Amino acid sequence: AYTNSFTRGVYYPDKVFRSSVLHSTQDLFLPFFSNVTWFHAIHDNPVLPFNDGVYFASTEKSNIIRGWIFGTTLDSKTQSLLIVNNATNVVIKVCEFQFCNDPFLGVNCTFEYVSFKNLREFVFKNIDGYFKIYSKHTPINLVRDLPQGFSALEPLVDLPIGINITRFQTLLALHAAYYVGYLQPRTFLLKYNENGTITDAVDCALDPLSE
Amino acid sequence: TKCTLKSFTVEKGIYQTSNFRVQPTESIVRFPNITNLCPFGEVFNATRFASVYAWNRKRISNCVADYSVLYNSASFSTFKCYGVSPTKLNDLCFTNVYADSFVIRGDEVRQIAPGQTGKIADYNYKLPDDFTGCVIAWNSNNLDSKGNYNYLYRKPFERDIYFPLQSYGFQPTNVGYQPYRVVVLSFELLHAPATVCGPKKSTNLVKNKCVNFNFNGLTGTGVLTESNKKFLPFQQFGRDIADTTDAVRDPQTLEILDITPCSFGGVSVITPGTNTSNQVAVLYQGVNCTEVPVAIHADQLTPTWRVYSTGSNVFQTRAGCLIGAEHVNNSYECDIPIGAGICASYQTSQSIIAYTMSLGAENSVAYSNNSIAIPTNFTISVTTEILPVSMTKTSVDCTMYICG
Amino acid sequence: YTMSLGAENSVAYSNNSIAIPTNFTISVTTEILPVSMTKTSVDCTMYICGDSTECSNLLLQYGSFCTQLNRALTGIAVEQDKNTQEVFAQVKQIYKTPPIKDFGGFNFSQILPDPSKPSKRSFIEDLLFNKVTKFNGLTVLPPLLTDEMIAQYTSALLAGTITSGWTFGAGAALQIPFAMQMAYRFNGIGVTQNVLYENQKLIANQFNSAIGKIQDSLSSTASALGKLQDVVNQNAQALNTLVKQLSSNFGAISSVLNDILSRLDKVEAEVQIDRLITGRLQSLQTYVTQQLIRAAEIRASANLAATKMSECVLGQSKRVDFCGKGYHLMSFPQSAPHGVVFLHVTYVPAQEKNFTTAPAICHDGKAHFPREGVFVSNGTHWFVTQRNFYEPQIITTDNTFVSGNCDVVIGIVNNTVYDP
Amino acid sequence: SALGKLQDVVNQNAQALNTLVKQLSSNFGAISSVLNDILSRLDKVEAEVQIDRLITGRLQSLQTYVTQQLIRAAEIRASANLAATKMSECVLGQSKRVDFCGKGYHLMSFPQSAPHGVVFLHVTYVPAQEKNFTTAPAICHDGKAHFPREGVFVSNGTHWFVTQRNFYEPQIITTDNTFVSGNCDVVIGIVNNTVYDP
Amino acid sequence: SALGKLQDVVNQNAQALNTLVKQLSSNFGAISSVLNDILSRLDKVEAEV
Numbered sequence A: 001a002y003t004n005s006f007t008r009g010v011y012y013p014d015k016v017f018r019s020s021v022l023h024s025t026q027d028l029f030l031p032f033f034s035n036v037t038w039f040h041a042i043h044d045n046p047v048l049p050f051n052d053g054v055y056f057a058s059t060e061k062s063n064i065i066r067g068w069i070f071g072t073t074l075d076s077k078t079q080s081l082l083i084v085n086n087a088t089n090v091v092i093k094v095c096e097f098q099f100c101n102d103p104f105l106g107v108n109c110t111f112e113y114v115s116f117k118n119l120r121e122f123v124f125k126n127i128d129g130y131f132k133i134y135s136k137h138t139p140i141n142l143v144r145d146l147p148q149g150f151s152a153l154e155p156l157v158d159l160p161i162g163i164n165i166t167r168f169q170t171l172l173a174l175h176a177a178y179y180v181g182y183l184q185p186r187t188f189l190l191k192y193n194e195n196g197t198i199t200d201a202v203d204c205a206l207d208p209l210s211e
Numbered sequence B: 001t002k003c004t005l006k007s008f009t010v011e012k013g014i015y016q017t018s019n020f021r022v023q024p025t026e027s028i029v030r031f032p033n034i035t036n037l038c039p040f041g042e043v044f045n046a047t048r049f050a051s052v053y054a055w056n057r058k059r060i061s062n063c064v065a066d067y068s069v070l071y072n073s074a075s076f077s078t079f080k081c082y083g084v085s086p087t088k089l090n091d092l093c094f095t096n097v098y099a100d101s102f103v104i105r106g107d108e109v110r111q112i113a114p115g116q117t118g119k120i121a122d123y124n125y126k127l128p129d130d131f132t133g134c135v136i137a138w139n140s141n142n143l144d145s146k147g148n149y150n151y152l153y154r155k156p157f158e159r160d161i162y163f164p165l166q167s168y169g170f171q172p173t174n175v176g177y178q179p180y181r182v183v184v185l186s187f188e189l190l191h192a193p194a195t196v197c198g199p200k201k202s203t204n205l206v207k208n209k210c211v212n213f214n215f216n217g218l219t220g221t222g223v224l225t226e227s228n229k230k231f232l233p234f235q236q237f238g239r240d241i242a243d244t245t246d247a248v249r250d251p252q253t254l255e256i257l258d259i260t261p262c263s264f265g266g267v268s269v270i271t272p273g274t275n276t277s278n279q280v281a282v283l284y285q286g287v288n289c290t291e292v293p294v295a296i297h298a299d300q301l302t303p304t305w306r307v308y309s310t311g312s313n314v315f316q317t318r319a320g321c322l323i324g325a326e327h328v329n330n331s332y333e334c335d336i337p338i339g340a341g342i343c344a345s346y347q348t349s350q351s352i353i354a355y356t357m358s359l360g361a362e363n364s365v366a367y368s369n370n371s372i373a374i375p376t377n378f379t380i381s382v383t384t385e386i387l388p389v390s391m392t393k394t395s396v397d398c399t400m401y402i403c404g
Numbered sequence C: 001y002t003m004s005l006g007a008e009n010s011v012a013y014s015n016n017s018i019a020i021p022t023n024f025t026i027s028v029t030t031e032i033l034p035v036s037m038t039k040t041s042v043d044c045t046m047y048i049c050g051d052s053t054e055c056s057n058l059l060l061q062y063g064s065f066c067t068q069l070n071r072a073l074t075g076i077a078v079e080q081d082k083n084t085q086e087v088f089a090q091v092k093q094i095y096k097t098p099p100i101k102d103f104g105g106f107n108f109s110q111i112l113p114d115p116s117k118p119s120k121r122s123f124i125e126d127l128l129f130n131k132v133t134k135f136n137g138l139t140v141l142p143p144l145l146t147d148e149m150i151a152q153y154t155s156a157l158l159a160g161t162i163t164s165g166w167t168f169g170a171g172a173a174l175q176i177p178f179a180m181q182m183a184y185r186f187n188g189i190g191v192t193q194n195v196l197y198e199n200q201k202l203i204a205n206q207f208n209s210a211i212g213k214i215q216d217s218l219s220s221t222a223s224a225l226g227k228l229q230d231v232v233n234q235n236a237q238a239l240n241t242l243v244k245q246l247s248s249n250f251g252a253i254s255s256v257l258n259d260i261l262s263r264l265d266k267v268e269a270e271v272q273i274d275r276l277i278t279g280r281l282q283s284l285q286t287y288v289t290q291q292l293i294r295a296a297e298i299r300a301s302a303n304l305a306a307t308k309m310s311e312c313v314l315g316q317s318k319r320v321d322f323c324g325k326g327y328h329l330m331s332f333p334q335s336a337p338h339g340v341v342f343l344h345v346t347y348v349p350a351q352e353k354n355f356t357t358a359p360a361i362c363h364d365g366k367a368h369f370p371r372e373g374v375f376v377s378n379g380t381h382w383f384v385t386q387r388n389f390y391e392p393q394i395i396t397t398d399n400t401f402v403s404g405n406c407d408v409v410i411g412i413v414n415n416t417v418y419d420p
Numbered sequence D: 001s002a003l004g005k006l007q008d009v010v011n012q013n014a015q016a017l018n019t020l021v022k023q024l025s026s027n028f029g030a031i032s033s034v035l036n037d038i039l040s041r042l043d044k045v046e047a048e049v050q051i052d053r054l055i056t057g058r059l060q061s062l063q064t065y066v067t068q069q070l071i072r073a074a075e076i077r078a079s080a081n082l083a084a085t086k087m088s089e090c091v092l093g094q095s096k097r098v099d100f101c102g103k104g105y106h107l108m109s110f111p112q113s114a115p116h117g118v119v120f121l122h123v124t125y126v127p128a129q130e131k132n133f134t135t136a137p138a139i140c141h142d143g144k145a146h147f148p149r150e151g152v153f154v155s156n157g158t159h160w161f162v163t164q165r166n167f168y169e170p171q172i173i174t175t176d177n178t179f180v181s182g183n184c185d186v187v188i189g190i191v192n193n194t195v196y197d198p
Numbered sequence E: 001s002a003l004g005k006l007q008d009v010v011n012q013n014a015q016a017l018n019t020l021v022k023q024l025s026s027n028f029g030a031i032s033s034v035l036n037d038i039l040s041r042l043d044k045v046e047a048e049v
């Protein structure tokens, strides 16, 4: 199955404040109106491709979707990236972790750290050995699906961890729904407001009017 | 004005000057205030360096560097830097630094540069064409030689984990065939907060005066001020339409500072001809009269110039503040145009007056539905009109002009 | 689609047919002209080097490029005040509007000043002024004349034009009643002046209504001001192009000059800074060259505007299709942002009739020709009439001059010519 | 200062040449402004770098001068076409075109030569010594409305006259000076008189 | 030769275009006038200069 991404998946290209300007930039972005693959928490935790970089989102009410796993083979042969979002805390690690092909949370390890009503949106990418995370949390009006509209994902992480990620997975609490899309190199026009905030955008390659 | 025109005589008019004012300025220095020393005394001094197929890589972060003591160490046979000069590393600073470490044969230094040739650079230590940082190397025949056949060789920054697994039997008796150590320092100059910085001490912070500031390596010059710009929490710099630094967050206090250039109030000098008088008046374009001495930094300006800040002979035109002309309520033909309806003249006991220009004598035509004025006489005028028709025919032997 | 060039029309030509207009419409065709452009000036040292001392020194070695650019832009800047003054300041006295508005039924109230605004722009000048929309060493200098001073001159030109005709151009203004000024404007297009007086209430209503249609046009339709808004857009776009070129590398390691000076030692930094100086300076030369050629385009329009002011405000112009379509009567100038608007009042003929016509008439052997106008017939009777408004007159020796005889003339017709 | 335009055309062209000459003193980042220094001080492998900076700078200076002269030549040509138009309409003719030929009503113009220019002595009639008069657009005679053939009706306060527009010259109002058009009713501001029939 | 102005306006534009095209033959100090020579003979770091 698929759904329409609309204008989702913009994020701040750099840690620079800009006021009122129409900035122009080129980076790995989710193409507008792209076919994102849609999943439900039923008989999920598969392994998907990572391709050149991922857009991920989940629609939520109680934090049933609690984490992610990334790497080449995800099977203790290498320092796999592991991430969990557990109520009062957030946890990020890389190590030779081991799991069966059905992981759940019960209702060379160079890094380790600890800190539907809603939508949680994310971008996960790697460039020049630097892993990055961008995110946003919001309430939503449309109960079914990704709402047609715009909001720029703010940065959470940069890590110099250098993993050759090609595959990834998401983690469920067991005794919910989520979306996967992929970034493409795109030139984007970004409208900054008076408050340093990106508030509209154009995917230049989308159509001749966007060009 | 005489200097702007390269002329000792100056005619009646208004002249936009080039700024020749002395503007002496002072320095200001700002950095994160973390106290750990960086591990360079480990990195340049380890028991054995890695094989270049699988080089060491250490992140350096959250610490104070001493590129000065490294650059002054007589250990190094080469210290070549790319996109940076080894001196400036002490005043510039970085979000992270990555040290890559390995042994080479002493002949191989050629392969360790942005985009260079050869099988080490092709297989297992590609450097990008725009590498920013330093390559530092020295002889290690005293340590890495034994022979030591373990020393093995085969996108940028990828460790390469028939066989490609070639190696050197390094011996103390080897001279280009001797082992050398190399460290590459790669520098992360991104817009995030700095975490590796040079030994340079931070000063106090100064506001509302022109200063040569450094924040984290941004060696600008300008008037620092506090500001009202609502930065998002992760943003560290703010930028102009020009893609130049318009604002910063200070590294020691998370307040947001504007930056602004010094003497942005443009100067025009209003003068009668110097053959008539040496008295002049100054228009500071755009500025507001109460701000003039602050705007031009009159606090550090030549006294004869400084007489053109304050003095009651001060007048706010819409074009900017006019100083050293006498405002007048009468109106006259425009002698020297200043702008926005203001003109100046030199008049009687003499001064430069400035006034709202007279558009002409006001008249009411004596109109009614039954009154007509008919002329009973005439005058034959002989109005003269002058027109250009040609200009001096030049011709340039451009080979003799350029290369004569 | 293939574009239409216009509606196709076979003119009903034949060797003895003439169409004479039996009526007219006044029209008030707006014409809009640029006169000046936003007066920029650039501190080329501040633009190229941004208070950097190393760059401020290096730019000296490129010599008088920097000062000859400031000279060229200063020439453009003064030329804008010259253009503006040549268009509006054609009148030496500020003629002020009369207290009582007894202009024979004509109603200028929408184009004369209003005391209700602190800058006394007329109603139509306020529509026009509503329909049209920094630290890097660039500056905008103000115009010499303020928008209010311009509105005093357009009022002076207008109050002269209304009270005194062309005479305020030729000498001191002479008062003349407005219904007498229009009789002069009608003789100036070969319409016999009784055609004004006999139709004065109609002509007043056509003029007053046409001014009203300009308020509706200007209230509804922003695209009429396209010439002026384009002159604003080009100069704002040229400024923004010149600013954004500060962000370009031109082959240096960074486009931000303080990066190079923070990051490289002086011997290396000079090579990088020479690229930024060369790029920024080449961008400035490009901008100034565009502005010189654009200022020449504006000056050509300013000289045209100054000429329409002299010929059609201060005068009446015989130059066909120079001051609006139709035969020109008079023009009222109105100020507008960086330009002028002329309300060209014109006479446009309408309601034709066809008539049988002859170049000459035979009486007793004598060939008679019209003194002014043409011979026509309703079929049964022959009349002489003026060329531009059907008004049949009996054919007489006052209306006609004799020359030669019936033998020579092609297409001559027999009639009686009456002896008064 | 009356000759300011022609003197300014001389000044601008002299200033452009003197600017173009002074740019030979600029080194444009080369080790000297003077080409024979570079050629005598440096060997070809090094000298070809520095001389290429001078060639680039001097060429860019010459291109700038030629661009100024092309634009200035277009400005002069617009003035030459204007002057040629004044010669044709204003010397070779009499011009109806208000304030094209000097100021006041045009009579004739005499050309005089001047350095890089032309000067026109525009002879013009300017009216003077106004009198105010009571006026009317038409005269009623015996119910017919009479209008002036040329000029306007005026009164000195006791008598009505017709006179040409631009020089007060009262004539008795007559059936030769005036044409009838319809009757008294239609005209706003008509006045009674007699009209004398010769 | 009566059509002097029109033929001159054609000639100037053809002359300007042919001059602009001929300038692609000029070295401007590069080792060849032809970009594909540089891109085939030189590796990137040398070629970019």
Ligand SMILES: *[C@@H]1O[C@H](CO)[C@@H](O[C@@H]2O[C@H](CO)[C@@H](O)[C@H](O)[C@H]2NC(C)=O)[C@H](O)[C@H]1NC(C)=O
Binding pocket: A072, A073, A164, A166, B155
């Ligand atoms: C990243 O890891 C993947 C495997 O996880 C590498 O992909 C293989 O590359 C070899 C050639 O080196 C191919 O023969 C295989 O078919 C590839 N496998 C797959 C599943 O694509 C990949 O080369 C690594 N990336 C880099 C830049 O080294």
Ligand SMILES: *[C@@H]1O[C@H](CO)[C@@H](O[C@@H]2O[C@H](CO)[C@@H](O)[C@H](O)[C@H]2NC(C)=O)[C@H](O)[C@H]1NC(C)=O
Binding pocket: C023, C024, C025, C202, C205, C206, C351
């Ligand atoms: C000449 O044309 C005008 C219109 O331009 C005519 O005036 C209109 O006449 C009709 C009646 O026929 C009225 O309803 C309109 O209100 C009039 N318009 C105006 C503005 O007054 C005029 O009647 C025509 N005259 C002749 C003799 O044909």
Ligand SMILES: *[C@@H]1O[C@H](CO)[C@@H](O[C@@H]2O[C@H](CO)[C@@H](O)[C@H](O)[C@H]2NC(C)=O)[C@H](O)[C@H]1NC(C)=O
Binding pocket: C101, C107, C109, C110
């Ligand atoms: C001139 O025209 C204006 C409208 O263009 C007339 O203004 C109106 O005047 C009356 C009172 O006389 C007011 O009731 C209206 O509200 C006015 N209209 C507007 C839009 O202001 C004015 O009366 C006319 N004057 C003459 C002498 O004709």
Ligand SMILES: *[C@@H]1O[C@H](CO)[C@@H](O[C@@H]2O[C@H](CO)[C@@H](O)[C@H](O)[C@H]2NC(C)=O)[C@H](O)[C@H]1NC(C)=O
Binding pocket: C378, C379, C380, C381
């Ligand atoms: C051509 O014009 C003449 C004069 O206007 C017309 O002759 C008059 O016609 C009216 C009726 O339309 C009569 O009341 C008059 O008595 C006629 N005058 C004379 C002297 O006889 C003539 O009818 C017009 N012809 C056409 C075809 O319109």
Ligand SMILES: *[C@@H]1O[C@H](CO)[C@@H](O[C@@H]2O[C@H](CO)[C@@H](O)[C@H](O)[C@H]2NC(C)=O)[C@H](O)[C@H]1NC(C)=O
Binding pocket: C362, C412, C413, C414
């Ligand atoms: C105008 O009227 C005259 C008579 O008044 C006509 O002249 C006669 O024309 C015929 C035919 O050519 C001749 O036989 C007669 O000898 C002519 N008489 C005279 C006195 O010349 C003339 O034909 C008429 N023309 C028109 C156009 O109607």
Ligand SMILES: *[C@@H]1O[C@H](CO)[C@@H](O[C@@H]2O[C@H](CO)[C@@H](O)[C@H](O)[C@H]2NC(C)=O)[C@H](O)[C@H]1NC(C)=O
Binding pocket: D156, D157, D158, D159
């Ligand atoms: C208006 O002009 C007429 C004609 O010039 C004047 O009438 C004459 O006045 C003089 C005395 O000034 C008498 O001798 C004549 O006999 C009058 N002529 C006629 C035909 O009446 C009249 O006086 C002038 N009025 C004014 C106020 O200047």
Ligand SMILES: *[C@@H]1O[C@H](CO)[C@@H](O[C@@H]2O[C@H](CO)[C@@H](O)[C@H](O)[C@H]2NC(C)=O)[C@H](O)[C@H]1NC(C)=O
Binding pocket: D140, D190, D191, D192
């Ligand atoms: C022109 O003179 C005539 C008389 O020769 C004036 O006509 C009289 O006007 C009054 C007032 O309206 C009427 O009571 C009479 O009946 C009219 N008499 C005739 C014979 O029509 C006329 O008013 C005068 N007009 C002007 C503008 O002075």
Ligand SMILES: *[C@@H]1O[C@H](CO)[C@@H](O)[C@H](O)[C@H]1NC(C)=O
Binding pocket: A002, A033, A034, A035
């Ligand atoms: C999404 O994919 C389907 C095929 O799976 C394709 O028909 C459709 O055109 C794609 N969406 C868009 C917006 O092109």
Ligand SMILES: *[C@@H]1O[C@H](CO)[C@@H](O)[C@H](O)[C@H]1NC(C)=O
Binding pocket: A084, A086, A087, A088, A089, A090, A091, A114
């Ligand atoms: C989140 O997980 C970490 C271990 O991964 C643990 O230390 C922390 O206490 C947990 N918090 C909650 C609320 O589960």
Ligand SMILES: *[C@@H]1O[C@H](CO)[C@@H](O)[C@H](O)[C@H]1NC(C)=O
Binding pocket: A096, A108, A109
């Ligand atoms: C790290 O890599 C080595 C081989 O280089 C491997 O033996 C070891 O098991 C890895 N570390 C962990 C914690 O598995």
Ligand SMILES: *[C@@H]1O[C@H](CO)[C@@H](O)[C@H](O)[C@H]1NC(C)=O
Binding pocket: A193, A194, A195, B230
């Ligand atoms: C900027 O932020 C303020 C609150 O700090 C808010 O009132 C305002 O609407 C915001 N403006 C924009 C353009 O988002």
Ligand SMILES: *[C@@H]1O[C@H](CO)[C@@H](O)[C@H](O)[C@H]1NC(C)=O
Binding pocket: B040, B041, B042, B044, B045, B073
């Ligand atoms: C390296 O270690 C030796 C002692 O083993 C010490 O004398 C020397 O100063 C050190 N040098 C550096 C650069 O750390």
Ligand SMILES: *[C@@H]1O[C@H](CO)[C@@H](O)[C@H](O)[C@H]1NC(C)=O
Binding pocket: B033, B251, B252, B253
């Ligand atoms: C800077 O130093 C002061 C003490 O001099 C310290 O209180 C402050 O926390 C430091 N700044 C930061 C950002 O920690």
Ligand SMILES: *[C@@H]1O[C@H](CO)[C@@H](O)[C@H](O)[C@H]1NC(C)=O
Binding pocket: B273, B275, B276
């Ligand atoms: C210079 O000034 C004197 C009066 O001081 C005057 O007579 C003379 O004409 C002036 N000359 C010029 C070239 O302005």
Ligand SMILES: *[C@@H]1O[C@H](CO)[C@@H](O)[C@H](O)[C@H]1NC(C)=O
Binding pocket: B288, B289, B290, B291, B316
């Ligand atoms: C000028 O600055 C003063 C404060 O110094 C302020 O009160 C005033 O409003 C300003 N006036 C203008 C015209 O900007």
Ligand SMILES: *[C@@H]1O[C@H](CO)[C@@H](O)[C@H](O)[C@H]1NC(C)=O
Binding pocket: B328, B329
């Ligand atoms: C000028 O006019 C103001 C009022 O507008 C008045 O207060 C002032 O005293 C006048 N100054 C002179 C020198 O006349």
